[PDB]
Amino acid sequence: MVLESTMVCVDNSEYMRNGDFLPTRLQAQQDAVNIVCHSKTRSNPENNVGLITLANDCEVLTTLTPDTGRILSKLHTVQPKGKITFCTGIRVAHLALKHRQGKNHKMRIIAFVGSPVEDNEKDLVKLAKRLKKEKVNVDIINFGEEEVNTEKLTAFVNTLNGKDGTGSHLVTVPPGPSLADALISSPILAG
Amino acid sequence: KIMKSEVLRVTHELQAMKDKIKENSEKIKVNKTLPYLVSNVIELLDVDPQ
Amino acid sequence: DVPGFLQQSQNSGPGQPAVWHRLEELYTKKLWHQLTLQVLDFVQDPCFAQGDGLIKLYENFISEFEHRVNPLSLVEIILHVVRQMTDPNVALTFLEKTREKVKSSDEAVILCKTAIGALKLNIGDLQVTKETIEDVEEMLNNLPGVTSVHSRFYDLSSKYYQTIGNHASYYKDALRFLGCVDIKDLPVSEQQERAFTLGLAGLLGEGVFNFGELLMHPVLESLRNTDRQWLIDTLYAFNSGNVERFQTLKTAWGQQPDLAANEAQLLRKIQLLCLMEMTFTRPANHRQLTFEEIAKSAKITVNEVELLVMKALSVGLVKGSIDEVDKRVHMTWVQPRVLDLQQIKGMKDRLEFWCTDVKSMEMLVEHQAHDILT
Amino acid sequence: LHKNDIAINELMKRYCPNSVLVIIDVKPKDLGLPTEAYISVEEVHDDGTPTSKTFEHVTSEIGAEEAEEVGVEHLLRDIKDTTVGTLSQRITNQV
């Protein structure tokens, strides 16, 4: 089947409980993690899935393991503190990819971004140059917005996305009362 | 019901305890299998000065 | 009430629609965090305090049933409600209502009891307010040492410093206020009185012997350059030693209120500084001295030097016991506690001398000792 | 001692009890005792600085209870015991 590692980064800021969008969509994207981990489990149950947030003091909630039975429990107690942290959020997983058991598992990291990015374009091109340098599949998922959705993040992805053939895809969700599961399951990354 | 949403984590910890007691409770059968001899017991209360 | 809020929201004063445009846009967008930031922007602006009585109750209710944003903003805006209304009767029901409303998610009880005690620190009650202040400092001694809540605790120690009962605690918390300052963003025009009553409070502080901790930090000597140097001069003289009595006499009579009764105790405090400096000036070369230097530097008679050294031993900063027959002054361990540069250079001299002497003895003994014994 | 050690030690402060810290050397060229016990406790500072994690030096001793003394003594066969007298005293008094 498919031998690859899955890393998800979820936001724990207070920007995920606003009443305009879904009613505390944290549970909705939790169900998204549930359907992508159970979908990858149905495709290849040997894939390991890690859990970590993007707070100031990043903490590895669950080590990369195919057993999601305790991951379901670890998805709770999100500790809604902090706002956003991007640099050590990338470096806390993309550098931790070397601690996986199976060396044959490809590198794939996703992230749920629910807060505006605090890093300037220089950090976007330095981190994009680092990720394109080490050649890691990066899927950017941006939930919620305050300013325009993609102004510098467009060039961030275009400069970050190498190997145009069957490479990485960008997930941009527009506002709407519909669920996010079917909207993020539309690209080829899900399934 | 937002304050009562933390009970799920407690129930997950308790069912995790029920999932983890099977090993340390399982060694009871191999450690407490058979007393090989018989020994008389005489009760005598002692004092240490928990 | 959302369709019913547009009427009183749109209709406002002449300049209010400037913030009511983005306020109603963020209100229709239902962004509770941006709405909260706009509320803090409206309260932070110097409003006329005339037509805001409606938005205080409206945003009070919205902050009550929103149950999303940190209710500390509600604490601040309700401090502006009790500050604008000046009604302490309903303040207990409002703050208690916030206590009943705020669930057990974040430890905000320190700021809740801080606001309650702060509002109760008026002439109505003092003792129970001091007790609940001790409860505030007693509750949370954990890792969140942001010290901002403890800086408001320093404000409560200032309203407690309004009482002449205890001056020592305001200096102990005033060291924490000395160490918790981040930048000069807060008004310097207030820092004039902050350093004024901070210097006077440090002088009147009877729970400390040296003043070098206050003057040692560069933020106060850097924030006192604008102020008149009549206090910096007497703080440097009180720190580095008072060899004359004319300047300390003119500044001893310069501050008229509350300094007459404390003047004698301040003399009993500064009479030890000449002792610690006279015993730490000469580290070696016949440290033994006589009462002539004490009586000469303190312009006191020979009959009171025994009570002077008896008080010096009663304070506990010195352990000196003299086995003399004819009047002599032998001293012991003492702490400078402020600074000494000639003792830093002399520390390098005597330290390097000790090191090269130990090295000389090591090479001398080990030189032939290693060759004959190994 | 790097700055990140407060975050590394903070995990075992949350999950585990108060953790002791030991700094050693990668090369055994230091003549001093390689082990230094640093307790992870927060102390109040007089200058007014905010309360932070402080590593106070706790004294340590290197001893073996029953078997490691025998194993070390057999594996070395070069070190000497206490041997009060001339050599063990004069070596300390020289070096």
Pick out its properties:
part of a larger assembly; 4 chains; C: 374 residues; mainly alpha; 64% helix; 0% strand; D: 95 residues; three-stranded antiparallel sheet; 3 helices
Give structural notes.
This is part of a larger assembly, with chains A (191 residues), B (50 residues), C (374 residues) and D (95 residues). Helices cover 30% and strands 18% of the residues of chain A. Chain A is α/β, with parallel strands linked by helices and 191 residues long. Chain A has a six-stranded mixed beta sheet, sandwiched between helices. In chain A, strand 2 (49-53) and strand 3 (60-65) form a beta hairpin. Chain B is mainly alpha-helical and 50 residues long. Chain B has two helices and no strands. Chain C is 64% helix and 0% strand. Chain C has helices at residues 5-10, 17-28, 32-44, 53-66, 72-85, 88-101, 109-120, 127-139, 148-161, 168-179, 188-204, 212-216, 218-223, 230-240, 246-252, 260-270, 273-281, 291-297, 305-315, 342-372. Chain C is elongated. By secondary structure, chain C is mainly alpha-helical. Chain D is α+β, with helices and mostly antiparallel strands and 95 residues long. Chain D has helices at 5-14, 68-76, 87-94; strands at residues 20-22, 37-42, 53-58. In chain D, strands 1-2-3 form a three-stranded antiparallel beta sheet. Chain D is elongated, with a radius of gyration of 19 Å. Classes of the chains: A alpha/beta (191), B mainly alpha (50), C mainly alpha (374), D alpha+beta (95). At the C-D interface, helix 10 and helix 20 of C face helix 3 of D.
Topology summary:
This is part of a larger assembly, with chains A (191 residues), B (50 residues), C (374 residues) and D (95 residues).
Chain A: E1 4-10, H1 26-43, E2 49-53, E3 60-65, H2 69-74, H3 87-94, E4 106-113, H4 121-134, E5 137-142, H5 153-160, E6 170-172, H6 181-184
Helix pairs in contact in A: 4-5
Chain C: H1 5-10, H2 17-28, H3 32-44, H4 53-66, H5 72-85, H6 88-101, H7 109-120, H8 127-139, H9 148-161, H10 168-179, H11 188-204, H12 212-216, H13 218-223, H14 230-240, H15 246-252, H16 260-270, H17 273-281, H18 291-297, H19 305-315, H20 342-372
Helix pairs in contact in C: 2-3, 4-5, 6-7, 7-8, 7-9, 8-9, 9-10, 10-11
Chain D: H1 5-14, E1 20-22, E2 37-42, E3 53-58, H2 68-76, H3 87-94
Antiparallel strand pairs in D: 1-2, 2-3
